[PDB]
Amino acid sequence: SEIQVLKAPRAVVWKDFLGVNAQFLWFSPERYNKQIDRLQDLGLEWVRLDLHWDRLETAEDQYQLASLDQLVKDLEARQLKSVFYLVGSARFITTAPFYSPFQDQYPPRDPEVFARRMAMLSQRYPSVAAWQVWNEPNLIGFWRPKADPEGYAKLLQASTIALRMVDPEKPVVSAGMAFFSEMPDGRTMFDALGHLGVESLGTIATYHPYTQLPEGNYPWNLDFVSHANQINRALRNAGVPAIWSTEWGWSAYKGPKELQDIIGVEGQADYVLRRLALMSALDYDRIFLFTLSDLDQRASVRDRDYGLLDLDANPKPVYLALQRFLKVTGPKLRPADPPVTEDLPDGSFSIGWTREDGRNVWLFWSARGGNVRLPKLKEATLHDPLSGKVTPLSGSDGLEVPVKSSLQMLVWE
């Protein structure tokens, strides 16, 4: 019946667990403060932000930090917890060959130079919650001309030492690896780094498992939970202090298709909730949805519509759905089992939790559907986070429940 039942390894406190990627430096403080209001309205506080070196040290030893000073101050005033990741080579340090069109997509000639920047940043901004080293080094667009475990490892080592020199308590996060860390030559960056003793550094491990569907790449092989469980298991076995997922999500873009199938604002709201349901029941210590806001032409066409909010900072359907979802769940969930069922359709997903008020929450869906019987329940409340619909249900000798392709939530006891 290919039914997939998930039970989480620990309690989930949404405020601690679920954060968002952000792109604040591309917005006025009036605009990003509005975005913050919306984030706070969800009960969340963690944000993740890039720091493109080439755009910050615009000439050797010359920095344009005025707006980043302001942002960091604003983030602190708004009580948000932030992780920044420094990525790309400034031109003076790049390993790019002469006349390269993308010098910054090459790594630094000397990792110590990069590491000294991370130390400068950590000192300048003590409020930042965590510091991340580079980004998706397994992907050619971030590390030319070839993925290089040895070199990323040196960069990571240098940066870790420098970051702990400034604050030995403050977490150091390794690069979020593209996808499940796969490299073009067939290796995985997680594997390759493991053979190099990277665990010695004790950095937080993280990857960016984008897939075509919330549960996998193909409708006939929803193997996301398997792959994820496999990777995290291996990460824990290797001695990582924590596992994050610093990026995941879908774009509402109309196209033309570039890798991701066109699913629109509604498909975004649907997919995002279904994947949130999975990931929050898997072995992650923290995840970051991509991303808080839609973006303008400074971003690729597809990248413009990953937002929870539009360019005016108004909720998109995904935001409204997520809000409904979080309201039903409450602030904290404790692992539980699903209700006992009869005739759960094949391919169903089933996840059980208990709320703060002690009531249970069942999260379920299936691509096929039909109904399911809950023999022991006499009463329950059905929620469809996508429509906003709430259906009180009553059974003398059990309830019947419709299964949709999209996530629904049942509040029962």
For 159-175, give the secondary structure using H, E and C: HHHHHHHHCCCCCEEEE
Task: State how far the Cα of 133 lies from the Cα of 48, in Å rounded to an integer.
Answer: 13
First-to-final CA distance of the chain = 26
CB 137, CB 175: distance < 8 Å = yes
Q: Which is it for strands 349-354 and 4-6: parallel, antiparallel or unpaired?
A: parallel
Task: State how far the Cα of 166 lies from the Cα of 130, in Å rounded to an integer.
Answer: 12
In the block, tokens 């008020």 appear at: 357
DSSP 294: -
- Using DSSP's 3-state secondary structure scheme, residue 54 falls into helix
Cα distances (angstroms) measured from residue 399 to each of 220, 340, 341, 346, 362: 30, 11, 10, 19, 14
CB atoms within 10 A of CB 145: 13
- CB-facing half-sphere around the CA of 53: CA atoms within 13 A: 30
DSSP 213: B
List of residues 6+ apart from 184 with CB closer than 8 A: 140, 147
Resolution in A: 2.0
Strands (E), 72-122: 81-87
The enclosing H or E element of 189 equals helix 189-194
In the block, tokens 């990792």 appear at: 111
Amino acid letter, residue 140: I
Task: State how far the Cα of 226 lies from the Cα of 255, in Å rounded to an integer.
Answer: 30
Elucidation technique: X-ray
- Residue 269 tokens, joined: 């709201």
Task: State how far the Cα of 298 lies from the Cα of 144, in Å rounded to an integer.
Answer: 22
Task: State how far the Cα of 367 lies from the Cα of 187, in Å rounded to an integer.
Answer: 33
Task: State how far the Cα of 241 lies from the Cα of 204, in Å rounded to an integer.
Answer: 6
CB atoms within 10 A of CB 304: 18
CB 118, CB 162: distance < 8 Å = yes
- CB-facing half-sphere around the CA of 109: CA atoms within 13 A: 9
Task: State how far the Cα of 103 lies from the Cα of 105, in Å rounded to an integer.
Answer: 6
- Residue 189 tokens, joined: 């960056």
Task: State how far the Cα of 315 lies from the Cα of 102, in Å rounded to an integer.
Answer: 35
Q: Which of 374, 385, 393 has its CA nearest to residue 409?
A: 385
In the block, tokens 């003076």 appear at: 92
Task: State how far the Cα of 108 lies from the Cα of 137, in Å rounded to an integer.
Answer: 12
Task: State how far the Cα of 150 lies from the Cα of 280, in Å rounded to an integer.
Answer: 32
Q: Cα–Cα–Cα angle for 290, 213, 11, nearest 5°?
A: 60
